[PDB]
Design a binder for this molecule. Sequence first.
Ligand SMILES: O=C(O)CNC(=O)C(=O)O
Ligand SMILES: [Mg+2]
Ligand code: NI
Ligand SMILES: [Zn+2]
Length: 331
Amino acid sequence: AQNPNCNIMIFHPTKEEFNDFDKYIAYMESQGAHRAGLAKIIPPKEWKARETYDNISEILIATPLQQVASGRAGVFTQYHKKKKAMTVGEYRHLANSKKYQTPPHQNFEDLERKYWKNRIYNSPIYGADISGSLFDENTKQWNLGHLGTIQDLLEKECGVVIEGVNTPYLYFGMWKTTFAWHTEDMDLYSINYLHLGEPKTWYVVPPEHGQRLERLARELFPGSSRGCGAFLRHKVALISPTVLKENGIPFNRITQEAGEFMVTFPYGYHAGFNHGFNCAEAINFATPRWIDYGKMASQCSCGEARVTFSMDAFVRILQPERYDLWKRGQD
Ligand SMILES: O=C(O)CNC(=O)C(=O)O
Ligand SMILES: [Mg+2]
Ligand code: NI
Ligand SMILES: [Zn+2]
């Protein structure tokens, strides 16, 4: 078995290997990359996502989210308070202000220490989940707006034609903005490109060990667990690396820098934080190997998780027993 310790792997494809996206994912899996839950892909030196980022300031963040924490430094939840609209130029100025800017630090490990010590005492503002793309239309390789769709994959594998669409999302971050512990909708893959700015640190649990994280989460968040049998689908719970180590949960960590891709694999729990002002683009995708994970994915039916239009068909076809209850949660 390849990669039996489930380490995060880093790949350096050549420009020739960068042509065929599906083929390269399958290659990475042949080397055991999926066992980690997360992989890094450094694009060939010839490649670029677009020519410059000089003209992005007028993008609108219609609903910036202030991420307010509750709990203790290593075990907390966050809720999202909606703020008034602002442009990317206005948000960048805010990120750089004395109130929100990255503190002085020695290196990424020092900044990580400071994040876990101090996150809960601040409420950073995240421009998340903005439909759109920063890839130039002429970028033909690893263009996250030109991937094969999940609906087409389901149709190719299973023969069933379904409604729905699959488009990318932009994320504008600042220091301390946080992504809570989660797997993707329907335990899909994700791919995330850091277009510009400061890094993003990731934590990940190997897919084969995801239920260990779920059992810890039920212990640490006992009211939430009584409320919902899949409350990590709410995307609000944080657990620090120190607490994971104290409870024996297997995990790994890595920092993504501008110009780098990350891929999350089916049922790879992940969480993380931004170092400073940045912009990322991400989208879900599927392969043949996902179908079995989609059939087994947990679902939130309590009403909290509320998701896209296109998840309806995935539940309806892959999980017809669960469909009626899940749809009630959506309505
Ligand atoms: O960058 C973020 O805030 C969160 N991204 C992801 O969870 C992802 O790409 O799967
Ligand atoms: Mg603009
Ligand atoms: Ni994710
Ligand atoms: Zn729920």
